[model samples]
Target: SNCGPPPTLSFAAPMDITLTETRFKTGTTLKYTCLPGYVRSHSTQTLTCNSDGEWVYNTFCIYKRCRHPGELRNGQVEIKTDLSFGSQIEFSCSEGFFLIGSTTSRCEVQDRGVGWSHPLPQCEI
Candidate 1:
């Protein structure tokens, strides 16, 4: 007796993204998409099912970053890196003042895209 169709295959992907098909048979092809506000990385987005019962997944999405964080009053920001995902920024108050919120903020990867881990820091008297 001969076996029926091949078994299904599965693979992993980043957050806020969905695969066109979760279960794939041999020689099948599928595509993925990044959720709104998220951008696809500079990699191949197409996956193929191999005869060895494995799915070839080789793509990823990066959190989108806004042009710049809004300006702050009475405080200066120490940028640690480019205003992109995984970057960090520290806030400091002018002399004779103190920070009213988190001292540091990080560009975090979110389901929608990139966002500040915390609200902009405020300077208090």
Candidate 2:
């Protein structure tokens, strides 16, 4: 096998990956995982060594998406951007009501998946 080490590009992927090895033998398969705040686009995100000792690379990851944030009572929700990874929103209060807590919420990586940060903002009448 002449394949020395697989090429890794951070900007190309636009996401970090995990695989700690300097040597990749033929028939060896490398599992590439999408970085945080990103979701894998396919289960075929695997790189392998071919018989000619060349690493065949193929995989992709997209921004983690979040659905519409919950409605605010007696208040308003301003969507700053599409609900994708790292997306943020703003909360406002209706007349006679004042907003409390963080007015802006950002979508981020959660334990289970991606979610809005500073969530559950409130309004006091």
Candidate 3:
């Protein structure tokens, strides 16, 4: 009273998730998140799987650009590499009324890029 054919579970030989050469190879279990407002100075929120495969510390994911507000007499914002990440700054407010909060602030790269502390985005009237 034996079955006959019931043993086919082959799925563990394609591990190469290199978001940018992070490394992971041992029961694979790398999973990091934070590319919109960065927040992981060096606590490694989550990066398991380290029996000998890889991913033990360095699950990058830090993106919290949007900073450079130190001098604004009226209205004028510009960011391209001051805090590089996703690099993308563009705002204006003085000819009429538009840039007040978020006209175009990006610069997101995450832990791997590490470039965001918070303080560069303010121009209202």
Candidate 4:
């Protein structure tokens, strides 16, 4: 018999899957996409239908992570949320020290995945 509806894998951000025509045959590959603000974990994105009408299911999505805004020499940083896509951090100087770059940096999505808006800001004497 042809395959029935695909199986559902539980996750905070449910995984996206697919197939073609009414009921799938063996050798059909199901694609996976981990929505925005999320990225693929150490798992395969493609699942193949087998004779048992079942494709191996596994967790493939996890929170996207931007590069850590490393410590600022003479400045302090305030992170409003956990480090992930769309997360923003505030920066400030220590007393006489002044900021040498952007005062705030926001985590953003890139062609290569999540990344910071800019390099870690710096403070100068």
Candidate 5:
């Protein structure tokens, strides 16, 4: 009897990505592309079909982070975490002033690029 088609393998990739091909045979290799605003994390962007007829995925992609958030006028920013993928920043106004925008903001990953969940906060007397 002859062996049937090779088994399919699944890979964990970012939401915005397209695979070169869905089907693979033994020893077959394929490449993938990360959608805009995303970057490959490592040098490996290709996967190969092993002798076991299983697809071996060894590459990954992550969201691209925006540049420094700068500052908020009339208010101070308190960073809860580093400016990486997912971080939080809190804004507060002075004692005599009140916050005009969102008091808290979170760094978010979007299809366009990394951005704040809410607009920068401002202070008004």
Candidate 6:
């Protein structure tokens, strides 16, 4: 079979990928988290690369406000919703009432994945 006219072949073109501020490689991993008070809606914690080579949606941290099981009639607190990873919130009592421990501290996500802001504010009667 030596009568061929330069064997013809067809192949698909390579896919184009766009890079963002946070770029990832084929075998690379990325972490996503939400601010204090909020929990991750997505179950996938750590994004891993598969043979197909695709990453899942990034994780987002949500706000989880300090929860006081028992309500306090005299207790009135105010906190800003501007929360993000490494963000902070401080608590203080009204006049006459004094606050315990640190008055102000940065928000932090607990190791147990519990939304906990640093320096839990305490109001004393």
Best by lDDT: 2
lDDT of 2 by residue, 1-125 (tens): 64667777441242244464667678887667677777777767766789898888665677888878779998998987688987888899988987888888888888867888787678996
lDDT string, candidate 3, 31-116, tens digits: 45454445445554444555644344453444455445444446676665665455666666676544445566655544554443
Query: Candidate 1 residues 5-99, lDDT tens each?
Result: 32332322333334534455577655556644457775766556676776566545565665567767888988876777667788888897878
Ranking by TM-score: 5, 2, 1, 4, 6, 3
Steric overlap count per candidate: 0, 0, 15, 0, 0, 8
Steric clash count of candidate 2: 0
Candidate 3: deviation at residue 104, Å? 8.4
Worst 10 residues of 5 by lDDT: 1-10
lDDT-based ranking: 2, 4, 5, 1, 3, 6
Ten consecutive residues with minimal summed lDDT in candidate 4? 10-19
lDDT score of residue 80 within candidate 4: 86
- What is the TM-score of candidate 4? 0.55
* Local accuracy by lDDT, each model: 0.64, 0.75, 0.47, 0.72, 0.64, 0.45
Residue range 19-108, candidate 6, lDDT tens digits: 433434555544444433456556654454444555534434344444432322344444555444455555667677767766555545
TM-score each candidate: 0.62, 0.68, 0.26, 0.55, 0.68, 0.37
Residue-wise lDDT of candidate 4 within 6-52, one digit each (tens)? 66544323244223455777767777667666777856776667787
Candidate 4 stretches with Cα past 4 Å from truth are 1-30, 35-37, 41-60
lDDT of 3 at 41: 54
Lowest-lDDT window of 10 residues in candidate 1? 1-10
All candidates: CA RMSD in angstroms?
5.8, 4.6, 11.8, 5.7, 4.9, 14.4
Better of 1 and 5 by TM-score: 5
